[PDB]
Ligand binder design. Sequence first.
Ligand code: FUZ
Ligand code: FUZ
Ligand code: FUZ
Ligand code: ZN
Ligand code: ZN
Ligand code: ZN
Ligand code: ZN
Ligand code: ZN
Ligand code: ZN
Ligand code: ZN
Lengths: 116, 116, 116
Amino acid sequence: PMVRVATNLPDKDVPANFEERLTDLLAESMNKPRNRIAIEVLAGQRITHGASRNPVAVIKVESIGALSADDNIRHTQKITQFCQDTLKLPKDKVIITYFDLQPIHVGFNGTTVAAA
Amino acid sequence: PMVRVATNLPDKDVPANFEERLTDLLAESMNKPRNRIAIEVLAGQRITHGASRNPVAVIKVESIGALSADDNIRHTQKITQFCQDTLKLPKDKVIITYFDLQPIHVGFNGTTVAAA
Amino acid sequence: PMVRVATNLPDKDVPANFEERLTDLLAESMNKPRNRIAIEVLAGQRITHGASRNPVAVIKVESIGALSADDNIRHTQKITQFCQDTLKLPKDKVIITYFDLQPIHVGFNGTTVAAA
Ligand SMILES: O=C(O)c1ccccc1NCc1ccco1
Ligand SMILES: O=C(O)c1ccccc1NCc1ccco1
Ligand SMILES: O=C(O)c1ccccc1NCc1ccco1
Ligand SMILES: [Zn+2]
Ligand SMILES: [Zn+2]
Ligand SMILES: [Zn+2]
Ligand SMILES: [Zn+2]
Ligand SMILES: [Zn+2]
Ligand SMILES: [Zn+2]
Ligand SMILES: [Zn+2]
């Protein structure tokens, strides 16, 4: 999985252990090994929702499977609660997109996942 | 919709009302409600096009529908004109990708849009 | 092609000619013209892989075709070797996602690529 979290909160409001705790959460929810999870954090960014600059997170989640309709309800419940607890965002200020990827469309260790 | 605008123009060159006006432009071109529109702006970024550092915008537009082939000509015309008027970019320096999403692949308010 | 390279390496460690060389590498690997290749470099960024902050690149490659299973094998070998040589990244610290786009989902010069 490859996760991007962008927020207009300042970098100092995203605790240093954010990536590591989000990696655990997704490892568990998506049944994926921790060494196959990358997290990007972009804090202090210009972001608006409804043209408002109130605190918000816009999140992208890519994974080779583990993203069925019912999985995504669970990932969303968990990620949203996690952003409430660690970022103090309201439940309605956490916007997530999922991308369900084929193994021919990911490259790792010098070749694609399908050709590993 | 969830829109990302990256530019090598400086942040001072992307006016403060940019996100507001883009939000209005998309609400109207897409017939989507203002409160379901997120805009990220990343200015002052390293970007090349044909390896040139001339001013350019690379834009991503995600939405659940409202992105048919025909819709996208309209969105492209309006977004490009808009970048011309507010960022002074040439018509041929505005690069846009559209991502037409299923509602099981979007998380908002703690669950998927499909489960709302 | 529209390529995003994010890394936790500092900006001063990603050479000024990075985007030139990557533009040539992709024009050649994908048989795409240089003037239809955009590259965004985001360095200095928070990124973890396996929760580790060791040097890493997370790369997104969008293109209208030129992304078959076979093509992606070659793109991956090339970009990975290129990251090793210019960024001193280990072979297993280059994570790439490919997005194979329809021409109705790409806006350029004020209309879709499909309608050009
Ligand atoms: O994202 C997946 O689901 C995946 C599953 C198995 C192998 C690779 C994978 N790709 C992403 C990745 C590679 C290294 C770190 O993140
Ligand atoms: O992207 C859409 O078309 C959409 C439609 C209905 C609900 C949510 C939606 N996107 C996620 C969102 C929530 C807030 C801002 O963006
Ligand atoms: O990405 C492609 O495969 C492509 C092919 C033909 C025309 C445009 C294209 N992409 C959008 C673009 C990138 C740089 C300028 O425009
Ligand atoms: Zn599942
Ligand atoms: Zn094998
Ligand atoms: Zn600013
Ligand atoms: Zn307005
Ligand atoms: Zn038509
Ligand atoms: Zn620089
Ligand atoms: Zn060259």
